[PDB]
């Protein structure tokens, strides 16, 4: 899995341990081993949500499988909860694009997962 | 909808009001209310387009529906016009990836849009 | 084609000529002219791979065609090779998302490639 968060919250507002917390929680939610989880947080961004520059986040979660209606609702509750608790971002100012990657379309370790 | 522009144009060259201008124009173009439009501008990037580093932009526009051949041509004229007028980027140095998201694959407010 | 590399390697560790090297190698690999190759490198990122903040990279390669099982394995060997040799990133700490864009979903020069 690959989880990317882009946010206008400043870097100093991202707590220490946040990437680890995301890695651990995504491993448990997706069922994937933690060694395959990649996380990326980009603060201090120039963005707006609904025309407003109040705290917001634009994110994406890609995975080879483990993407679907029920699973994605569960991931949204988890990830919006973490963004609210740790970055003080309201859940209604968060978008998460979920995408299911074919194993043949994911490069890793000089090859693909197909 | 979610619009992202990554550019090598410096931050000081992004005019005041640009995010609001993008939010308004994308609300009119997609027909979606401005409260549902998210915009993200990332200046000062290290990029090249066609092997050169004159001003350029790599962008994406995601929407739940409102994505198609004719609509995408209209969006390109609008967004290339805005990038040329406000950031002085030639339209032939702009790529925009359009993507149609399923509602069940977009997380927002602790759930999805399904 | 559009190639983006996001990495925690510092900016000073990106060699001069890297964008040109990626442009030429991707033009040769995809068979497309270098004039249509866009490259984007984002260093100094707050990211983890497998819970670790050792050097890593999260990348994507989009193209209108030239995406498939065998081609992607070849691209992965090429791009992991360049990231290892030029940025000192281990190939097992690199993910590359390959995506095949429809020409009508790629905006350029006030229209699309359809």
Swiss-Prot record, chains A, B, C:
InterPro entries: Macrophage_inhib_fac (IPR001398), Macrophage_inhib_fac_CS (IPR019829), Tautomerase/MIF_sf (IPR014347)
Name of a matching Pfam family: MIF
Any one of the GO BP annotations: negative regulation of gene expression
Subcellular location, record wording: Secreted; Cytoplasm
SUPFAM superfamilies, A to Z: Tautomerase/MIF
The entry's keywords: Acetylation, Cytokine, Cytoplasm, Immunity, Inflammatory response, Innate immunity, Isomerase, Secreted
Active-site residues, Swiss-Prot/TrEMBL: 1
Superkingdom of origin: Eukaryota
Main subcellular localisation: secreted
Inducing factors: Up-regulated in concanavalin-A-treated lymphocytes. Up-regulated in macrophages upon exposure to M.tuberculosis antigens.
One MF term in the entry's GO annotations: protease binding
EC numbers for this chain: 5.3.2.1, 5.3.3.12
Binding of substrate, residues: 32, 64, 97
A single Gene Ontology CC term: nucleoplasm
Record PTM N6-acetyllysine, positions in chain: 77
Catalytic activity: 3-phenylpyruvate = enol-phenylpyruvate; L-dopachrome = 5,6-dihydroxyindole-2-carboxylate
Modified residues (N6-succinyllysine): 77
Role: Pro-inflammatory cytokine involved in the innate immune response to bacterial pathogens. The expression of MIF at sites of inflammation suggests a role as mediator in regulating the function of macrophages in host defense. Counteracts the anti-inflammatory activity of glucocorticoids. Has phenylpyruvate tautomerase and dopachrome tautomerase activity (in vitro), but the physiological substrate is not known. It is not clear whether the tautomerase activity has any physiological relevance, and whether it is important for cytokine activity.
Record family assignment: Belongs to the MIF family.
Additional information: Serum levels of MIF are elevated in patients with severe sepsis or septic shock. High levels of MIF are correlated with low survival. Drugs that inhibit tautomerase activity protect against death due to sepsis.
Subunit structure: Homotrimer. Interacts with CXCR2 extracellular domain. Interacts with the CD74 extracellular domain, USO1, COPS5 and BNIPL.
Clinical note on disease: Rheumatoid arthritis systemic juvenile: An inflammatory articular disorder with systemic onset beginning before the age of 16. It represents a subgroup of juvenile arthritis associated with severe extraarticular features and occasionally fatal complications. During active phases of the disorder, patients display a typical daily spiking fever, an evanescent macular rash, lymphadenopathy, hepatosplenomegaly, serositis, myalgia and arthritis.
UniProt xrefs under PANTHER family: D-DOPACHROME DECARBOXYLASE, MACROPHAGE MIGRATION INHIBITORY FACTOR
Name assigned to this protein: Macrophage migration inhibitory factor
Gene name for this UniProt entry: MIF
């Amino acid at each position: 899995p690959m989880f990317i968060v882009n946010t206008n919250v400043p870097r100093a507002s991202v707590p220490d341990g946040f990437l680890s917390e995301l890695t651990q929680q995504l491993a448990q939610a997706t069922g994937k081993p933690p060694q395959y989880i990649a996380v990326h947080v980009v603060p201090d961004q120039l963005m707006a949500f609904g025309g407003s520059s109040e705290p917001c986040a634009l994110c994406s979660l890609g995975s080879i499988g483990k993407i679907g209606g029920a699973q994605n609702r569960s991931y949204s509750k988890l990830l919006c909860g973490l963004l609210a608790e740790r970055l003080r971002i309201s859940p209604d100012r968060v978008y998460i694009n979920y995408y299911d990657m074919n194993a043949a379309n994911v490069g890793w370790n000089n090859s693909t997962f197909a």
